Design an enzyme around this catalytic site. Structure first.
Site, PDB file in Angstrom:
ATOM      1  N   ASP A  32       0.916  -0.990   0.051  1.00 30.69           N
ATOM      2  CA  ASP A  32      -0.084   0.179   0.121  1.00 30.69           C
ATOM      3  C   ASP A  32       0.854   1.406   0.024  1.00 30.69           C
ATOM      4  OD1 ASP A  32      -3.228  -0.170   0.965  1.00 30.69           O
ATOM      5  OD2 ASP A  32      -2.422   1.893   0.651  1.00 30.69           O
ATOM      6  N   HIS A  62      -3.823   5.991   3.567  1.00 27.00           N
ATOM      7  CA  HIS A  62      -4.586   4.713   3.156  1.00 27.00           C
ATOM      8  C   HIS A  62      -4.023   3.529   3.806  1.00 27.00           C
ATOM      9  CE1 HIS A  62      -5.787   1.821   0.169  1.00 27.00           C
ATOM     10  NE2 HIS A  62      -6.965   2.565  -0.105  1.00 27.00           N
ATOM     11  N   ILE A  77      -6.744   1.515  24.175  1.00 30.81           N
ATOM     12  CA  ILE A  77      -6.667   2.998  23.309  1.00 30.81           C
ATOM     13  C   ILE A  77      -7.282   2.535  21.965  1.00 30.81           C
ATOM     14  CG2 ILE A  77      -4.948   3.879  24.603  1.00 30.81           C
ATOM     15  CD1 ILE A  77      -2.960   3.551  22.211  1.00 30.81           C
ATOM     16  N   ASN A 153     -13.860   0.002  -6.847  1.00 36.06           N
ATOM     17  CA  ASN A 153     -14.871   0.686  -6.351  1.00 36.06           C
ATOM     18  C   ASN A 153     -15.683   1.511  -7.556  1.00 36.06           C
ATOM     19  OD1 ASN A 153     -13.870   0.322  -3.682  1.00 36.06           O
ATOM     20  ND2 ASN A 153     -12.724   2.131  -3.990  1.00 36.06           N
ATOM     21  N   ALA A 163      -7.233  -8.403  -8.295  1.00 34.36           N
ATOM     22  CA  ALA A 163      -8.277  -9.394  -7.690  1.00 34.36           C
ATOM     23  C   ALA A 163      -8.617 -10.199  -8.641  1.00 34.36           C
ATOM     24  CB  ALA A 163      -9.173  -8.565  -7.087  1.00 34.36           C
ATOM     25  N   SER A 215     -11.207  -1.411  -0.511  1.00 33.05           N
ATOM     26  CA  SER A 215      -9.833  -1.363   0.298  1.00 33.05           C
ATOM     27  C   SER A 215      -9.954  -1.575   1.725  1.00 33.05           C
ATOM     28  CB  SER A 215      -9.197   0.114   0.033  1.00 33.05           C
ATOM     29  OG  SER A 215      -8.592   0.340  -1.346  1.00 33.05           O
TER      30      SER A 215
END
Ligand SMILES: [Ca+2]
Ligand SMILES: [Ca+2]
Length: 269
Positions: A32, A62, A77, A153, A163, A215
């Site tokens: 990424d 991202h 946290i 998307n 993919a 993503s």
């Protein structure tokens, strides 16, 4: 205080955590924009294939967000990953702008296969095929990496590359109603879906932010794969992929959803 993002609960990661399954001992590479140092992440190593960005820190946001869906630490946290004890590696293949090349992505895949990764998360894609990319997906797969990639998307009834390739596990996105998100690409080659709308995760500046996309769905599945590998250390990439699909919850047709919604509880039972 720690909160549990809705998608983490939707994929039933807490039930796996309650059985002692956290992704410990499983190496997961995030291919990424990098991963930034963050008090809710433990980054074990990595490499950069983006010329001019030799650090693996994230100039975009991202990659840090994706990483936290996989592996945000289980503490007091922030948020909580699907596989909070996964061994996380920052493999920078996209620059601060959010893009790279088929060559940088291929170099990250080869790095994964040469450095002992069990899972590689590719929250990235293009509409077009690439011989360079396909060769690297296949090489990593031969080296035991489970390549998990976002369907894209565009909203179309065909999915993006890498993919689409047989040796990538393609992940689409669902919403809080367990419907396909309108943007989530579907069709031939789609394997599974996971939450991808209003997904809160770690973000640079030592903060937390929400994003929408395939993503965001992809790392839920990469994390679930790490839980399955911890439970079943002898299993191959193919065995893990098949078990995630076989234990997913059907949501509708295989063309829209693949096998359906990933279910970490059913996959680790
Ligand atoms: Ca946390
Ligand atoms: Ca596929």
């Amino acid at each position: 205080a720690q909160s549990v993002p809705w998608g983490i609960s939707r994929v039933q990661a807490p039930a796996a955590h309650n059985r002692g399954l956290t992704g410990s001992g499983v190496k997961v590479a995030v291919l990424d924009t990098g991963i930034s140092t963050h008090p809710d992440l433990n980054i074990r190593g990595g490499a950069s294939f983006v010329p001019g960005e030799p650090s693996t820190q994230d100039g975009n946001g991202h990659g840090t967000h994706v990483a936290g869906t996989i592996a945000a630490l289980n503490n007091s946290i922030g948020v909580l990953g699907v596989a909070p004890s996964a061994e996380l590696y920052a493999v920078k293949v996209l620059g601060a702008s959010g893009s790279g090349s088929v060559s940088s992505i291929a170099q990250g895949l080869e790095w994964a296969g040469n450095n002992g990764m069990h899972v590689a998360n590719l929250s990235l894609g293009s509409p077009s095929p690439s011989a360079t990319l396909e060769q690297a997906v296949n090489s990593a797969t031969s080296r035991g990496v489970l390549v998990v990639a976002a369907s894209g998307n565009s909203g179309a009834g065909s999915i993006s590359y890498p993919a689409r390739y047989a040796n990538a596990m393609a992940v689409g996105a669902t919403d809080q109603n367990n419907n396909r998100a309108s943007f989530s690409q579907y069709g031939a080659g789609l394997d599974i879906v996971a939450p991808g709308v209003n997904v809160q995760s770690t973000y640079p500046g030592s903060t937390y932010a929400s994003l929408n996309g395939t993503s965001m769905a992809t790392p839920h599945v990469a994390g679930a794969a790490a839980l399955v590998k911890q439970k079943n250390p002898s299993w191959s990439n193919v065995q893990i992929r098949n078990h995630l699909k076989n234990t997913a919850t059907s949501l509708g047709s295989t063309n829209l959803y693949g096998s359906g919604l990933v279910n970490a509880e059913a996959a680790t039972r």
